Design a protein around this ligand. Structure first.
Ligand code: HXK
Ligand code: HXK
Lengths: 334, 321
C-alpha cells in the first residue's frame, strides 16, 4: 500500500499540470500539501479497504482498490487539516499543523482542505470512471463526508450558547461566549450522536463499503455493516477519550469520562465540575483530573469488555467468513 | 425572473429534510435545523443571482418536472457561489459581504464553524443533484462539470492568494513565525499571469458551469462545448477586469488590471514602495479601460461563430446585464 502512494499523488499532480514558471510553483506547493499531510499516519482506514476487498486478484484490480484506499487517506488528511484549523491546534503527527506554517497560514489551509477533498473525486474518475460501482462509490464518499460534517458541527457546538430554541444574533460580532458546559447535554444519547457521525461513517463504514462495492456486492448486508460501524466508532472514540486523560478538559469537550463522572457523582461534585471544566485556569483542570476518584480508569475497562462483546456478537451474525475475519482482525489492531 | 427566487425554499428544505432523517435525538435535530436554515438563508439569498438565471435562460433557449430539475441546477450554482463567498471571506479576512457582516465574523459562528460550513454547502450541492437528477442520463456529466469547475476555481484562488508571496521567487516546514511582510513582485506584473488567475478563479464557475448545466440537461460531447469554454474564458476576463475598474484592492496587495496597465506604461515603478499599504494618483495620471471594454466586447460578440440562435441570444443578453 504505502508504496502505491506516489503513483496517485502524481496522477493528480499531473492533472493540475495540464504558464510554465507558474506550473512549477504550483507543483512544489501541492506536492508538499500531499506529502506533509497524507504520510505519517498509521493508515488504518487505508489498509481496511485493501483487506476487505481482498477477502470478498490481478494488478488492474489492486490499482483500483489502492486508489480507493488512498482516497480515504486523503480524505483523512483533509479532515485533519480542517480540524486543526477549527480547534486551533499546535501539533499533529509530531509536527506543526499545516495551517500554522508561515508559508501556509489559515488562508491557504482552508483552500487546501477544499483541494484535498476535491482531489479524491478526481482520482476516482481516473481509476474507476468505467466501473459499474463508480456512481455508488462517489456517493459513499459524499454521504460519509456529510455525516462527518454534521458530527463535527455537533462536537464544536454542543456546549455553545446557541444550544431555549433562542436563535442567532446576526448582529453580534463582538464579545465571546465564556465557554460553559451545559448539564443538559451531558448524556450518553447525545455523545453517541456526536461520536457516530463525527467518526464512524468515514473511519469504518466508508472503507468497508468501498472494498465491498468494488468486489461486486444493494444487498441487505450493507445495513449490517453500517451497524457494526456505528458500534466500532463508539468503542473507539471512547478508547481515545480514556487515553486523552493519562487538551480536552480545557478544550471544553464532551468526553466519555465527563459523562460517566457526571451520572455518578454527588450533587455537590457536579457543581465543582461546572466551575472547573473548560476554564483556562490550571487549578480548575488539576481538579477535574482528581474527580476522575470515581475510578473512571476502572469503569472504562468494564465498558471495553462489554462493548467488544457487543461488536463481536454483531459480526458473527454477518454470515461472511472473509469479512468477519477482517473485522475481528481490525478490532485487535484498532 | 423571481420565479427562480421562488423555488428557493423547496431546495433548501429538501436538503434540510435529508439532514433531519439522520439517526439523532429530537432536541438535537431541532438545533441542527435552526442552524443550517440560517446558514443557507444568510449566505444564499441577497445576491444578484446572475449565475442562477443563466442556467434557467440557457436551458429555456418545458413542463414542470423539467423546471424542477433546471431550477435545482440553478440553485446549486447559487449554493456554490455562497460557499465560495464564505470561504473567500475567511481567507481574505473580510468585513462586509452583501451589505451585512461576513458569516465567519459572527460570534455564534466564528472561523471554526465557517470552515465546516463551506464543506457543508459544497457537499449539499451534490446531494441536491442526486435528489433531482439521479435518474437523468446527464447526471454523471453534471456532477463532473461541478467538480471540474470547482477544481479550476480552487487553483485560481490559490494563484490569486500567492502570486506576490515569498514562495513565488526565483517551503520551510519549520517556520511558524508571523508571516513575511507582503511585497509585490515585478516579475508577476504581466497580462499572461493575470489571465491565468482571472480565468481559473472566476470564468469556469461563473460562466462555463451554468451554461454547460443548461446545455447538458437539454440534451447536448458535441464540439460546441469547447466553443462555449472559450467564450466563457473571454467573458471571465471581460468581467473581472470591469470589477477591477470599479475598484480595498491596492490595500490588499492584489494583482489588478489597473496595476498591470500602469506598470507597462509608467522611476514611477519604484509603486513598489506604496502598493500593499498615491498609487491612486498614479492611476488618474496615466480611459484605458473604456478602450479595452470596447475591444473586448467586440472579441466576445465575434466568438458568439457559435451557430445556435437560442444560445447566441442569451449570451448577447447576459453581456448586456
Ligand atoms: C469537516 C471537519 C473534519 C472533521 C474530522 C474530525 C477528525 C477527528 O476524528 C478522529 C478521531 C480519532 O480518535 C482518530 C482520528 C485519526 S487516527 C490518527 C490520529 C492522530 C494522528 C494520526 C492518525 C492516523 O492514523 O492517521 C480521527
Ligand atoms: C474554495 C476556493 C475559494 C473560492 C474563491 C472564489 C472567489 C469568489 O468570490 C467572487 C468572485 C467573483 O468573480 C465575483 C464575486 C461577486 S458576484 C456576486 C456577489 C455578491 C452577490 C451576488 C453575486 C452574483 O453575481 O450573483 C465574488
Amino acid at each position: 500500500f504505502r508504496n502505491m502512494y506516489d503513483k496517485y499523488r502524481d496522477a493528480f499532480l499531473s492533472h493540475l499540470n495540464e504558464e510554465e514558471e507558474i506550473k512549477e510553483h504550483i507543483s512544489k506547493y501541492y506536492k508538499l500539501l500531499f506529502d506533509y499531510n497524507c504520510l505519517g499516519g498509521k493508515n488504518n482506514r487505508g489498509i481496511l479497504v485493501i483487506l476487505i476487498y481482498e477477502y470478498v486478484i490481478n494488478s488492474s484490480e489492486w490499482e483500483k482498490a489502492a486508489c480507493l484506499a488512498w482516497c480515504i487517506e486523503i480524505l483523512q488528511a483533509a479532515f485533519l487539516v480542517a480540524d486543526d484549523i477549527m480547534d486551533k491546534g499546535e501539533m499533529r503527527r509530531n509536527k506543526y499543523c499545516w495551517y500554522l506554517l508561515k508559508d501556509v497560514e489559515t488562508k491557504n489551509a482552508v483552500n487546501d482542505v477544499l483541494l484535498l477533498y476535491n482531489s479524491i473525486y478526481k482520482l476516482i474518475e481516473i481509476y474507476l470512471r468505467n466501473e459499474s460501482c463508480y456512481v455508488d462509490v462517489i456517493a459513499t464518499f459524499r454521504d460519509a463526508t456529510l455525516k462527518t460534517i454534521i458530527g463535527q458541527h455537533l462536537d464544536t457546538n454542543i456546549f455553545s450558547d446557541k444550544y431555549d430554541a433562542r436563535e442567532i444574533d446576526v448582529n453580534n460580532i463582538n464579545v465571546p461566549e465564556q465557554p460553559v458546559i451545559d448539564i443538559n447535554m451531558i448524556n450518553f444519547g447525545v455523545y453517541k450522536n456526536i461520536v457516530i457521525h463525527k467518526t464512524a461513517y468515514y473511519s469504518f463504514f466508508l472503507p468497508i463499503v468501498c472494498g465491498m462495492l468494488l468486489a461486486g456486492i444493494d444487498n441487505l448486508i450493507y445495513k449490517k455493516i453500517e451497524d457494526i460501524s456505528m458500534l466500532m466508532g463508539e468503542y473507539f472514540q471512547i478508547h481515545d477519550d480514556y487515553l486523552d486523560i493519562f487538551s480536552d478538559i480545557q478544550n471544553n469537550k464532551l468526553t466519555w469520562p465527563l459523562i460517566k463522572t457526571f451520572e455518578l457523582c454527588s450533587e455537590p461534585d457536579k457543581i465543582k465540575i461546572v466551575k472547573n471544566y473548560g476554564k483556562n485556569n490550571l487549578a480548575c483542570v488539576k481538579v477535574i483530573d482528581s474527580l476522575y476518584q470515581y475510578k473512571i480508569r476502572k469503569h472504562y475497562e468494564s465498558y471495553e469488555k462489554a462493548q467488544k462483546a457487543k461488536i463481536l456478537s454483531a459480526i458473527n451474525e454477518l454470515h461472511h467468513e472473509g469479512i468477519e475475519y477482517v473485522l475481528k482482525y481490525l478490532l485487535e489492531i484498532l
